[PDB]
Amino acid sequence: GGSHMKSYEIALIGNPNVGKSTIFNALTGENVYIGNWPGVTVEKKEGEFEYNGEKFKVVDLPGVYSLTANSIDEIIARDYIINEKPDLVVNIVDATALERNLYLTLQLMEMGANLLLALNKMDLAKSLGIEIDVDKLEKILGVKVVPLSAAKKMGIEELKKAISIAVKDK
Numbered sequence: 001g002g003s004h005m006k007s008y009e010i011a012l013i014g015n016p017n018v019g020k021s022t023i024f025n026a027l028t029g030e031n032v033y034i035g036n037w038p039g040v041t042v043e044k045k046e047g048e049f050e051y052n053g054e055k056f057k058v059v060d061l062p063g064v065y066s067l068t069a070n071s072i073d074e075i076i077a078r079d080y081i082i083n084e085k086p087d088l089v090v091n092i093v094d095a096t097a098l099e100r101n102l103y104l105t106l107q108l109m110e111m112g113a114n115l116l117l118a119l120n121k122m123d124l125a126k127s128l129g130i131e132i133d134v135d136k137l138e139k140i141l142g143v144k145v146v147p148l149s150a151a152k153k154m155g156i157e158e159l160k161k162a163i164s165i166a167v168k169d170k
């Protein structure tokens with residue numbers, strides 16, 4: 001007997017230095033396990049948060065620019081996405097270098113990942129005069145995008161909500 005909280009598995013992936021760690025910490029806080037991927041010194045962060053009565057397991061994937069097989073990072077990440085089948089892939093994208101960030105995003109879509117796009121660093125883009133038409137972006141990609149500035153703690157609660165929804169979309 002007892003309670004059964006419905007549970008989900010989500011993965012965070014993006015280029016290095018886009019706010020992945022910042023977003024991971026904001027989502028999971030103190031519930032966090034830090035270890036290595038097997039037989040390797042690549043860090044594996046996992047944690048969970050609870051939202052609207054459901055449990056969300058988060059795994060931080062290694063930062064990568066592409067999902068070929070040019071590094072063990074890429075191999076680890078690709079193998080996880082294809083073969084561990086997360087309920088949702090949150091692709092964290094840096095608004096201050098969209099074009100280069102989207103290279104990875106495209107491969108992700110092309111793998112049939114259940115995608116949600118977290119468009120981070122909106123504040124940095126604003127201050128550098130970088131213009132992003134978020135709507136045009138959603139439309140062209142055909143994936144939901146959530147603008148935020150995780151370091152400034154804005155849009156994180158949006159992200160949480162959008163995640164709880166994009167997950168029921170498997």
Ligand SMILES: Nc1nc2c(ncn2[C@@H]2O[C@H](COP(=O)(O)OP(=O)(O)O)[C@@H](O)[C@H]2O)c(=O)[nH]1
Nearest residue numbers: 016017018019020021022120121124149150151
């Ligand atoms: N301006 C700005 N900086 C950010 C934001 N999110 C993260 N950063 C900074 O970007 C740098 C890299 O963030 P981090 O989470 O370590 O990126 P990661 O390598 O993808 O895991 C850090 O100095 C963060 O403080 C944001 O929304 N706006």
